[PDB]
Scaffold this motif. Sequence first.
Motif, PDB file in Angstrom:
ATOM      1  N   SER A  15      29.344 -13.112  26.063  1.00 48.94           N
ATOM      2  CA  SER A  15      28.620 -13.816  24.943  1.00 48.94           C
ATOM      3  C   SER A  15      28.772 -13.671  23.733  1.00 48.94           C
ATOM      4  O   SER A  15      29.382 -12.569  23.398  1.00 48.94           O
ATOM      5  N   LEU A  16      28.388 -14.266  22.509  1.00 45.34           N
ATOM      6  CA  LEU A  16      28.423 -13.981  21.156  1.00 45.34           C
ATOM      7  C   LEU A  16      27.787 -12.524  20.740  1.00 45.34           C
ATOM      8  O   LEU A  16      28.588 -11.637  20.310  1.00 45.34           O
ATOM      9  N   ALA A  17      26.420 -12.397  21.402  1.00 48.66           N
ATOM     10  CA  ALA A  17      25.829 -11.242  21.265  1.00 48.66           C
ATOM     11  C   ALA A  17      26.636 -10.200  21.531  1.00 48.66           C
ATOM     12  O   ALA A  17      26.801  -9.111  20.794  1.00 48.66           O
ATOM     13  N   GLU A  18      27.105  -9.852  22.589  1.00 46.16           N
ATOM     14  CA  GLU A  18      27.915  -8.880  23.198  1.00 46.16           C
ATOM     15  C   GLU A  18      29.014  -8.840  22.382  1.00 46.16           C
ATOM     16  O   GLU A  18      29.759  -7.729  22.040  1.00 46.16           O
ATOM     17  N   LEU A  19      29.858  -9.864  21.779  1.00 49.10           N
ATOM     18  CA  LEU A  19      30.956  -9.930  21.100  1.00 49.10           C
ATOM     19  C   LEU A  19      30.624  -9.501  19.588  1.00 49.10           C
ATOM     20  O   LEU A  19      31.204  -8.611  18.959  1.00 49.10           O
ATOM     21  N   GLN A  20      29.434  -9.864  18.885  1.00 47.87           N
ATOM     22  CA  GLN A  20      28.640  -9.574  17.372  1.00 47.87           C
ATOM     23  C   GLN A  20      28.399  -8.071  17.410  1.00 47.87           C
ATOM     24  O   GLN A  20      28.238  -7.597  16.323  1.00 47.87           O
ATOM     25  N   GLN A  21      28.182  -7.643  18.598  1.00 49.63           N
ATOM     26  CA  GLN A  21      27.799  -6.303  18.523  1.00 49.63           C
ATOM     27  C   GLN A  21      29.044  -5.096  18.865  1.00 49.63           C
ATOM     28  O   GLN A  21      28.751  -3.838  18.964  1.00 49.63           O
ATOM     29  N   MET A  22      30.066  -5.598  18.826  1.00 48.07           N
ATOM     30  CA  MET A  22      31.349  -4.824  19.126  1.00 48.07           C
ATOM     31  C   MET A  22      31.673  -4.152  17.666  1.00 48.07           C
ATOM     32  O   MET A  22      31.619  -4.755  16.668  1.00 48.07           O
ATOM     33  N   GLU A 103      36.719 -15.494   8.469  1.00 51.67           N
ATOM     34  CA  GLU A 103      37.223 -14.240   9.149  1.00 51.67           C
ATOM     35  C   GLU A 103      36.361 -13.671  10.128  1.00 51.67           C
ATOM     36  O   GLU A 103      37.091 -13.500  11.246  1.00 51.67           O
ATOM     37  N   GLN A 104      35.402 -13.920  10.209  1.00 50.04           N
ATOM     38  CA  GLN A 104      34.293 -13.731  11.494  1.00 50.04           C
ATOM     39  C   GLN A 104      34.729 -14.588  12.644  1.00 50.04           C
ATOM     40  O   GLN A 104      34.736 -13.850  13.757  1.00 50.04           O
ATOM     41  N   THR A 105      35.093 -15.686  12.394  1.00 47.39           N
ATOM     42  CA  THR A 105      35.283 -16.476  13.488  1.00 47.39           C
ATOM     43  C   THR A 105      36.765 -16.323  14.076  1.00 47.39           C
ATOM     44  O   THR A 105      37.216 -15.939  15.214  1.00 47.39           O
ATOM     45  N   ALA A 106      37.843 -15.771  13.150  1.00 48.33           N
ATOM     46  CA  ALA A 106      39.115 -15.307  13.621  1.00 48.33           C
ATOM     47  C   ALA A 106      38.884 -14.091  14.388  1.00 48.33           C
ATOM     48  O   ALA A 106      39.404 -14.072  15.563  1.00 48.33           O
ATOM     49  N   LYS A 107      38.036 -13.083  13.940  1.00 48.70           N
ATOM     50  CA  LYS A 107      38.047 -11.774  14.482  1.00 48.70           C
ATOM     51  C   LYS A 107      37.179 -11.863  15.739  1.00 48.70           C
ATOM     52  O   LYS A 107      37.880 -11.561  16.865  1.00 48.70           O
ATOM     53  N   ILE A 108      36.160 -12.553  15.744  1.00 57.43           N
ATOM     54  CA  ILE A 108      35.446 -12.816  17.070  1.00 57.43           C
ATOM     55  C   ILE A 108      36.421 -13.577  18.073  1.00 57.43           C
ATOM     56  O   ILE A 108      36.095 -13.429  19.123  1.00 57.43           O
ATOM     57  N   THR A 109      37.332 -14.648  17.631  1.00 54.22           N
ATOM     58  CA  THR A 109      37.889 -15.384  18.624  1.00 54.22           C
ATOM     59  C   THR A 109      38.839 -14.561  19.116  1.00 54.22           C
ATOM     60  O   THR A 109      39.217 -14.673  20.410  1.00 54.22           O
ATOM     61  N   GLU A 110      39.362 -13.600  18.395  1.00 56.12           N
ATOM     62  CA  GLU A 110      40.382 -12.525  19.026  1.00 56.12           C
ATOM     63  C   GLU A 110      39.758 -11.691  19.896  1.00 56.12           C
ATOM     64  O   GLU A 110      40.170 -11.610  21.054  1.00 56.12           O
ATOM     65  N   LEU A 111      38.611 -11.059  19.510  1.00 48.85           N
ATOM     66  CA  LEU A 111      37.969 -10.157  20.528  1.00 48.85           C
ATOM     67  C   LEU A 111      37.595 -10.949  21.724  1.00 48.85           C
ATOM     68  O   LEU A 111      37.659 -10.272  22.850  1.00 48.85           O
ATOM     69  N   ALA A 197      35.345 -22.227  26.500  1.00 47.56           N
ATOM     70  CA  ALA A 197      35.409 -23.308  25.684  1.00 47.56           C
ATOM     71  C   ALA A 197      33.929 -23.329  24.966  1.00 47.56           C
ATOM     72  O   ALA A 197      33.953 -23.801  23.881  1.00 47.56           O
ATOM     73  N   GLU A 198      32.834 -23.221  25.536  1.00 44.57           N
ATOM     74  CA  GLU A 198      31.443 -23.534  25.256  1.00 44.57           C
ATOM     75  C   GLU A 198      31.109 -22.289  24.140  1.00 44.57           C
ATOM     76  O   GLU A 198      30.857 -22.353  23.042  1.00 44.57           O
ATOM     77  N   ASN A 199      31.669 -21.235  24.687  1.00 38.02           N
ATOM     78  CA  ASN A 199      31.747 -19.966  23.909  1.00 38.02           C
ATOM     79  C   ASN A 199      32.440 -19.903  22.459  1.00 38.02           C
ATOM     80  O   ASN A 199      31.837 -19.798  21.492  1.00 38.02           O
ATOM     81  N   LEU A 200      33.509 -20.800  22.358  1.00 40.82           N
ATOM     82  CA  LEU A 200      34.174 -21.311  21.016  1.00 40.82           C
ATOM     83  C   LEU A 200      33.367 -21.906  20.376  1.00 40.82           C
ATOM     84  O   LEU A 200      33.238 -21.935  19.042  1.00 40.82           O
TER      85      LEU A 200
END
Lengths: 242, 242
Positions: A15-22, A103-111, A197-200
């Motif tokens: 999820s986002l949270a898990e990704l945002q805390q990376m 940039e945050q979307t790019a980075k997070i989308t990549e991760l 897709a939802e995640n995106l």
Amino acid sequence: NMKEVTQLPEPQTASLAELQQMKLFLKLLKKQEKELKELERKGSKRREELLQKYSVLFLEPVYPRGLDSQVVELKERLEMELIHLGEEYHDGIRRRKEQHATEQTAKITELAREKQIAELKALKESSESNIKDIKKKLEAKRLDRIQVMMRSTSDKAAQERLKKEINNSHIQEVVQTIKLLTEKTARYQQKLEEKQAENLRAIQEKEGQLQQEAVAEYEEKLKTLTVEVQEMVKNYMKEVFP
Amino acid sequence: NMKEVTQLPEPQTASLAELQQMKLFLKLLKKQEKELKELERKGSKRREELLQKYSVLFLEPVYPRGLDSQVVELKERLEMELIHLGEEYHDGIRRRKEQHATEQTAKITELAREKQIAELKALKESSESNIKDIKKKLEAKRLDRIQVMMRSTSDKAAQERLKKEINNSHIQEVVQTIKLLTEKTARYQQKLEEKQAENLRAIQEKEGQLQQEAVAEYEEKLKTLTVEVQEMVKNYMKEVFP
């Protein structure tokens, strides 16, 4: 039919949270904050440089005329430049925040796309292993339904009619268990893609909010700009003369 | 009035059709088709290589240790090694096919990804570009309104009031106008990301059908396998003895 035959990992995605805390994401945010502090310093220095510029002008001699208060003129001109700088300043911050969001979307989308590849690959491999270990249990049964069938009959005709009727079950239940397992693995891949897709969508919804917060702040600043400038130029003048 | 200064690039991303024609994608399809023929070669060589083995076994002189015919002992044994060869062979085609399905998605998702980033980038630069020229026009109008004003009013207190109203207008009009494009840019981006999602979805749908097809063939092949061998053998038992 048989439930031990069909496994397949559950449709899960970070999820986002898990990704945002990376880590990689957390340093970007810190990078971005450094960028905002720099712009602020540069902005602050620039305002001072603009004021310093007039400290110079207000000391230069003025040659007489009617309405010779061309000293109040400079005052007005300074006020307007501060407004101009005030504008430029907050617009810049505004554009920078919008860039950060990108940039945050790019980075997070990549991760996320990275983990998602694994999720998908993990699913596929799980699908194949089953198949393999499902055909082994099925064929292994083949030899056994035969070894036993033989162990209880001796009539080259009937003895074989069964060997024929048994290699018939095998060939048939493998096509069966493989279909249902395939069909199933397909339900899972799809759930998995949808979750992603939802995640995106959520990632994109976050960017929107950030874009929206950048514009509100921008407005919120220009609300009081003209007045903050009125007040500072009043104090500035006292220091320039009395 | 507005549509002149708030114009943005209408949302559009290459279709699955446009992408399935790009060089890199078509070369992959060509490569993958090369891999299928190689498997077919290894498939045939292995079958030929299996009959050769039974050439030796069959025509090998026998030292009677019992009575039952030893030709049948091999005939049936041959049939089962061909069956098994068929099972691993088609399963292999299935696994490779599906592997090709995962390769096309990866590839096309690549191409799409690149264009979609460029689109989002084009929309954003366009938007900000409008904002820049909006600020230029608005501020140009401001200067002109002041100019025209000063020469039709020759009374300080008066022209100061008018300046404040004009200047006031300008600042707020840029903020509200920037707030507008920003809202429209948000609508154009949302719709744009929406198409991209739909496109990805079309792609996964394609892979889904390929994989589906790869399994349909496997099933088919396996259901006829038992006969295609017993026959090929019959013909074979006429090339060996008769």
